[PDB]
């Protein structure tokens, strides 16, 4: 059945709750972003109002064929009324089109649902600065102190410098980058920009990218693989077997592959700096796992919450085990005692 952490008290609303059938008493279904664990259940047969960003609404129409009459896109950073309740959508610094949702309940309670987010100090100067938030529905993906990672900027600097060196030493090397969802487009776009190439990809992935309102996108991507030396493949093909196979398909144009897997966290992070990352190599194939995250590190999460000072926190991730739930609640109490709220 629908879990309680997907329901907004005092409303008829749910968040990211499309796989439970008709949720009893739900008048408006919000969708924070277009990732499959959150949209699971939507299709052309859905007939309830879906509230989302413009970008998510483009993907619902074009990829899932949801009918236009049930898609209700909202502008960001704008007070809107939905079924009699004031709401605001804020940028979540996750994947394209991802939002956090502020609800202003008729009784005076204010609720923030982060969806999936990567906390940032820039959020301290949005419309969140303007009033008190009482309850926080928090993306707790990496809520433990072992989870450190570098800035996105440091990671992209590493990737650009690595790719440019490799291709300048060998102009017959191909760069491959893995993907299995939207998000992390900076990785492949930044590498293609330094190399003077478009990114080549499947027709399905090109269609998906054309929904994202990215500026000058026609100049950066293509379905013509032959004209490109940065290729995007499914994450599943980013291994020695899959890469050897792909190289065969390129008809002797290339004699080496340098491949990137933008993972979330991996335990080489507790020891190793970004400067010190090395690939796995077999023959003329090298694979780099780079820690490009679109979720908060532990320290980023803690800073956001200690700034916001909510009265009550409701985790939305890692909620399935008692040991995880108890660990998270211990951190919440530490943060509150350190900060004095
Ligand atoms: Ni997500």
Curated annotation (Swiss-Prot):
It comes from the Eukaryota. Expressed in brain, heart, kidney, liver, pancreas, placenta and skeletal muscle. It is found in: Nucleus. Induction: During mitosis. The mRNA encoding this protein contains an internal ribosome entry site (IRES) in its 5'-UTR. This 5'-UTR generally suppresses translation while specifically promoting expression during mitosis, when cap-dependent translation may be impaired. Belongs to the DNA repair metallo-beta-lactamase (DRMBL) family. May be required for DNA interstrand cross-link repair. Also required for checkpoint mediated cell cycle arrest in early prophase in response to mitotic spindle poisons. Possesses beta-lactamase activity, catalyzing the hydrolysis of penicillin G and nitrocefin. Exhibits no activity towards other beta-lactam antibiotic classes including cephalosporins (cefotaxime) and carbapenems (imipenem). Binds constitutively to TP53BP1. Binds CDC27, which is itself a component of the anaphase promoting complex (APC). Binds PIAS1. This is DNA cross-link repair 1A protein. It comes from Homo sapiens (Human). The chain holds residues 700 to 1040 of 1040 of the full protein.
């Amino acid at each position: 059945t629908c879990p309680f952490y997907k329901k907004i008290p005092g409303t008829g609303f749910t968040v990211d709750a499309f796989q439970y059938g008709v949720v009893e008493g739900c008048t408006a279904y919000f969708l924070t972003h277009f990732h499959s664990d959150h949209y699971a259940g939507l299709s052309k047969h859905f007939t309830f109002p879906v509230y989302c960003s413009e970008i998510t609404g483009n993907l619902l129409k074009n990829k899932l064929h949801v009918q236009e009459q049930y898609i209700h896109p909202l502008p960001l950073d704008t007070e809107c009324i939905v079924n009699g309740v004031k709401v605001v959508l804020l940028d979540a610094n996750h994947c394209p089109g991802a939002v956090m949702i502020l609800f202003y309940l008729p009784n005076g309670t204010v609720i923030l649902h982060t969806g999936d987010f990567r906390a940032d100090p820039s959020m301290e100067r949005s419309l969140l600065a303007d009033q008190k938030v009482h309850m926080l529905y928090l993306d707790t993906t990496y809520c433990s102190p072992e989870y450190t990672f570098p800035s996105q900027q440091e990671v992209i600097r590493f990737a650009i410098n690595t790719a440019f060196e490799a291709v300048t030493l060998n102009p017959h090397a191909l760069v491959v980058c893995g993907t299995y969802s939207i998000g992390k487009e900076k990785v492949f776009l930044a590498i293609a920009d330094v190399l003077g190439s478009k990114v080549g990809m499947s027709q399905e992935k090109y269609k998906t990218l054309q929904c994202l309102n990215i500026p000058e996108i026609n100049s950066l991507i293509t379905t013509d693989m032959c004209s490109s030396l940065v290729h995007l493949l499914p994450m599943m093909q980013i291994n020695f077997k899959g890469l050897q196979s792909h190289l065969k398909k390129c008809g002797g144009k290339y004699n080496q592959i340098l491949a990137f897997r933008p993972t979330g966290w991996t335990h080489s992070n507790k020891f190793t700096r970004i400067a010190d990352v090395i690939p796995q190599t077999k023959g003329n194939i090298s694979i780099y796992g780079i820690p490009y995250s679109e979720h908060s590190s532990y320290l980023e999460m803690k800073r956001f919450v200690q700034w916001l000072k909510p009265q009550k926190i409701i985790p939305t991730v890692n909620v399935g085990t008692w040991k995880s739930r108890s660990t998270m609640e211990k951190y919440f109490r530490e943060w509150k005692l350190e900060a004095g709220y």
